[PDB]
Structure formats: C-alpha cells, structure tokens
Specification:
Chain lengths: 105, 106
C-alpha cells in the first residue's frame, strides 16, 4: 500500500494528514509528524540535488517525481518513490500539496 | 478560501480529512463528518443528473468538476463549485480522492 502526505500550501508546507501506509513505511505515528515539514524523513546520504529539485518544484507548484533516500523513525534507510502534486481550486489557487510514497528498497 | 475533503478510495469513500475552510463553508466540524460519505451535503433541490455524473466519475476514478447545490449543517442552501480528483501512485493505483469546494452562491 502506498503512503500519502497532505500539507498546507504556504509557509513551510506543514503536514496536516497522513494515511495508515505512511506509518507502515516510515515508522512514524501521525501525532509526531503533524505540523512538521516532511524533510525530517531525509538524512546524511540523501542526495542534495534531488532535494533541490523538490524545493524548486514545490515553490513553483509543479508536479515532480523523485526516488529519494529517506530514514524510518528508528534510523533505517529506505528508498522512497515520491510523487508530489498541487491541489488547486477552479481559479488556480493552490489549496494543498499531496505526496505519495512507495517503498521501492 | 476553498474547502478540501480527502476520502478513502474504496467502500463508498468515507471522509478521512477536511481543512478549516470546509467547516467555514458547510458549518460542519471535522468530528461531525469523519467516517461519512460527503453526500450528506446534498438535499431536495440538488440536481439528480449532477449527482449521477459524480457517482459514475468516482466509480471510474475519473476527475470531475460540477456546480452543485449543497446544504450547510443548519439547512442553508449554497452553490458549491466542486472539483474531485483521484490521487494515484506511480503504478496507477488509487490511494485516495481529494475534493475542493468553493462557495459561488454570490
Ligand atoms: C506533500 C509533500 C510531501 C512530501 N513528502 C516527502 C517525503 O516523503 N520524503 C521527503 O524526503 N521529502 C518530502 N517532501 C519534501 C520536503 O518537505 C521538502 O519540500 C524538500 O526537502 C525540499 O525543501 P527543503 O530544501 O526546504 O528541504 C514533501 C513535500 C510535500 C509538499
Ligand atoms: C473526495 C470527495 C469529495 C466530495 N465532496 C462533495 C461535496 O462537497 N458535495 C457533494 O454534494 N458531494 C461531494 N462528493 C460526492 C458524494 O460523496 C457522492 O460520491 C456523490 O453524491 C455520488 O454518489 P451517490 O449517488 O452515492 O450519492 C464528494 C466525493 C468525494 C469522493
């Protein structure tokens, strides 16, 4: 089952919702991720160029997919097949961001 | 500010998350809608043909936009510019549905 993260659109995109699979994949409970930017999932061997591509896509509200090294709560590395998309209203305003995570380790 | 609803993808799409704007637009608190299908927003003057188009689009996991008559918790009608889209993983599996609501009554 694929993980899902929903964030606010503005400020530093704090997490507002995660599904059950997110907790299975990452080892984090909803309570200890809500209100935080998802970058806490990154660690020492995370590719800086990949992070920079995500940063630019989110700033521009462009859809992007990356295979990125992430870390479970316990510190074990896993490969995250990550896809991020903006959620827009009819006038094109960004209402939220949705991220979908697949463990492809 | 536009409302947002997230639902599970299967078994009649129970609500799993709503944003603050959803409560402002509809008059329902998150506690009053979690675990329920969003169709409680509909009422007697809601256009049946519009509801049918939503039902067929959601069953097929196809994005859909409709202007639909909805009802606040207290019964006040409002026009809802509603956009529903499936959230897919890279294998094409539907993970969730996302709905965006704009009150266009004015
Ligand atoms: C909805 C959403 C979900 C995200 N999910 C992840 C994730 O699962 N893993 C990850 O490493 N980064 C994820 N990110 C990206 C980070 O939150 C952040 O945007 C990225 O590291 C680039 O920004 P920074 O340079 O400020 O860290 C997600 C971002 C958004 C908006
Ligand atoms: C994510 C999502 C959000 C929805 N939001 C609304 C809404 O704001 N107003 C509404 O009348 N119906 C909304 N619906 C549609 C109903 O939940 C239902 O799918 C529709 O009425 C057709 O099904 P039915 O014939 O079983 O009622 C939404 C559906 C989904 C999946």
């Amino acid at each position: 089952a694929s993980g899902m993260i929903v964030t606010d659109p503005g400020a530093d995109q704090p997490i507002v919702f995660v599904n059950r699979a997110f907790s299975t994949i990452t080892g984090y409970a909803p309570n200890e991720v809500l209100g935080r930017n998802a970058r806490f999932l990154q660690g020492p061997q995370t590719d800086a160029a990949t992070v920079a591509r995500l940063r630019e896509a989110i700033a521009a509200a462009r859809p992007i997919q990356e295979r990125i090294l992430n870390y479970r709560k316990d510190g074990q590395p896993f490969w995250n097949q990550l896809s991020i998309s903006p959620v827009r209203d009819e006038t094109g305003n960004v209402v939220a961001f949705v991220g979908v995570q697949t463990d492809v380790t």
